[PDB]
């Protein structure tokens, strides 16, 4: 299957209360593997998955150096953007940056990403060609010009097409037992009367990896999208995911309904019926 590596960075100002808090997290696919938290005691990049603990001190020292530099850049950004938007010094603001790369089933580069948000809205993003920038408004155009002059896109392209892909492969190899696995969903259905003339049928998918899944209900083969309660796919806390989909069935009509499950770990999609 395809794979991805992503790093996510959040900095939040707290005027009067010291430096902004900075949190970095790194993922391969849907598995977190590192963190940094400016408020924590270690002041180091830390492992958050067992497979990465085998990395040595060279690795951890280097990642710590880099993430500290990221922390400083983003602290400065909070001040610069406060100025660019003519905002008061009293309020808390947020900056977010995400970057990373995708590869296909052949582990070859598919695409690269680098984007930046201020107070939860797009600020500046590298376009798919990794050569040009989208800027959200007039403030952002200024940053675009600074980053054009400093040839940032060329640097990021080299990272995204090169380093990121090489390391994603390295991590996939080194963490093979966790990262190269598929856990097919374990499925079941529940049935609960809501009255004497209706019942809820809930179709469950549990303990699956990766998180990507499709769960749908049909009635006599017709999709029931508008009448299905579908929850967001949610972490179990153990590296697997969960999801369910429910429909309210008039009593006596259970046989009309089918639940359809599609997941990488299922060679053929499943069709479930209450019967």
């Amino acid at each position: 299957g395809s794979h991805s590596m992503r790093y996510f960075f959040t900095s939040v100002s707290r005027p009067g209360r010291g430096e902004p808090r900075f949190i970095a997290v790194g993922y391969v696919d849907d598995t977190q593997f590192v963190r940094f938290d400016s408020d924590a005691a270690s002041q180091r990049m830390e492992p958050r998955a067992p497979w990465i603990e085998q990395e040595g001190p060279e690795y951890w020292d280097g990642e710590t150096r880099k993430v500290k530099a990221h922390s400083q850049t983003h602290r400065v950004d909070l001040g610069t953007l406060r100025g660019y938007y003519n905002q008061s010094e009293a309020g808390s603001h947020t900056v977010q940056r995400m970057y990373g790369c995708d590869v296909g089933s052949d582990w070859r580069f598919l695409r690269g990403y680098h984007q930046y948000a201020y107070d939860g809205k797009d600020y500046i993003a590298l376009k798919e060609d990794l050569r040009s920038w989208t800027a959200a408004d007039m403030a952002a155009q200024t940053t675009k010009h600074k980053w054009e002059a400093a040839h940032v896109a060329e640097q990021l392209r080299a990272y995204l097409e090169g380093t990121c892909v090489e390391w994603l492969r390295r991590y996939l190899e080194n963490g093979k037992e966790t990262l190269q696995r598929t856990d097919a969903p374990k499925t079941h259905m529940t049935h609960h009367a809501v009255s004497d003339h209706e019942a809820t049928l809930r179709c469950w998918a549990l303990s699956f990896y990766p998180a990507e899944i499709t769960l749908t209900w049909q009635r006599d083969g017709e999709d029931q999208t508008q009448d299905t309660e579908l929850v967001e796919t949610r972490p179990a806390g153990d590296g697997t995911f969960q999801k369910w989909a429910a429909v309210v069935v008039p009593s006596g009509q259970e046989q009309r309904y089918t639940c359809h499950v599609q997941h990488e770990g299922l060679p053929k999609p499943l069709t479930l019926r209450w019967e």
Partner: peptide
């Protein structure tokens, strides 16, 4: 796999 280049102030 921390980018070491391309991460500049706004």
């Amino acid at each position: 796999x921390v980018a070491g280049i391309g991460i500049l102030t706004x």
